[PDB]
UniProtKB/Swiss-Prot annotation:
EC number(s) on file: 1.13.11.6
Catalytic activity as recorded in UniProt: 3-hydroxyanthranilate + O2 = (2Z,4Z)-2-amino-3-carboxymuconate 6-semialdehyde
Protein name: 3-hydroxyanthranilate 3,4-dioxygenase
Function: Catalyzes the oxidative ring opening of 3-hydroxyanthranilate to 2-amino-3-carboxymuconate semialdehyde, which spontaneously cyclizes to quinolinate.
GO molecular function: 3-hydroxyanthranilate 3,4-dioxygenase activity; electron transfer activity; ferrous iron binding
Coiled-coil intervals, chain numbering: none
Principal location class: cytoplasm
Matching HAMAP family: 3_HAO
Cellular component aspect of the GO annotation: cytoplasm; cytosol
Linker: region residues: 159-175
Binding residue positions for substrate: 51, 93, 103
Binding residues annotated for Fe cation, in chain numbering: 45, 51, 89
Length: 283
């Protein structure tokens, strides 16, 4: 059950290049995925959940549509970034890179969308909305449909093929700056080692990426998965009758419906990632 994050990436190295570029480490309530490149594209993904990006190896560029403007969010190696819900985004990946993306299982009410725009404008050229179960697998025919369309050929939209409006309001939020994960952890060392766990992004988002220093935690049975990643030093997770020693870079998925006890050593640093849909921000 313990997975050394870079050890898992090395074992699955061949996944992080075309044609598929990705491999899901975890794929139940919490989608923990690792993505490579090269992969340059003009399609913009839109969803009701949030997406956490972290660059393990090399840099990536997340193109976003923010408050009526095109913006390129450069995510450098070691940088973490949280995308709020319903922001159109188009990830650009390069050869020999590895990025972590965390997202969640959709609620049965939730729609995902894929859009192509007319050149450098906000006018929609082609769009498809769907109920997401396996994102990569569902996007492939949509993209193939686009590349075989009159819209791609002419660069002109077919009005009858566009929705009158999106199924939900698109985000009105300002996008944060990506930040160095190690720099933020080091700058907050006194609070972390004083037994106070800290939210990296705060209460204005659904997702909770929490940093933990020394101390003891107890996780109650939840209908959401929790992913733990020991960054520095070690800790012990007691779960399902077993004591699991997390060494530097070890990660552990706590499946929905499982309780656990967590004992973190002095000087140790770990993260937990939760994307609970009950915490979705009102529209
Ligand atoms: Fe996305």
């Amino acid at each position: 059950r313990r997975l050394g994050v870079r050890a898992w990436v090395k074992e699955n190295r061949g996944s992080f290049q075309p044609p598929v570029c990705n491999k899901l480490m975890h794929q139940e309530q919490l989608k923990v995925m690792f993505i490579g490149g090269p992969n340059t594209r003009k399609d913009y993904h839109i969803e009701e959940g949030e997406e956490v990006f972290y660059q393990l190896e090399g840099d990536m560029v997340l193109r976003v549509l923010e408050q009526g403007k095109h913006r390129d969010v450069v995510i450098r190696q070691g940088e973490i970034f949280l995308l709020p819900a319903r922001v159109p985004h188009s990830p650009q990946r390069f050869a020999n890179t590895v990025g972590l993306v965390v997202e969640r299982r959709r609620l049965e009410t939730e729609l995902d969308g894929l859009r192509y725009y007319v050149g450098d404008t906000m006018d929609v050229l082609f769009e498809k909305w769907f109920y997401c179960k396996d994102l990569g697998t569902q996007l492939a025919p949509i993209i193939q449909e686009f590349f075989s369309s009159e819209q791609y050929r002419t660069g002109k939209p077919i009005p009858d093929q566009l929705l009158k409006e999106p199924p939900f309001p698109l985000s009105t939020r300002s996008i944060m700056e990506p930040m160095s994960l190690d720099a933020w952890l080091d700058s907050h060392h006194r609070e972390l080692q004083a037994g106070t766990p800290l939210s990296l992004f705060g209460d204005t988002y659904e997702t909770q990426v929490i940093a933990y220093g020394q101390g003891s935690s107890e996780g109650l049975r939840q209908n959401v998965d929790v992913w733990l990643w020991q960054l520095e030093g070690s800790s012990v997770v007691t779960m399902g009758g077993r004591r699991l020693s997390l060494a530097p870079d070890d990660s552990l998925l706590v499946l929905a419906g499982t309780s656990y006890a967590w004992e973190r050593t002095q000087g140790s640093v770990a993260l937990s990632v939760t994307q609970d849909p009950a915490c979705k921000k009102p529209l």
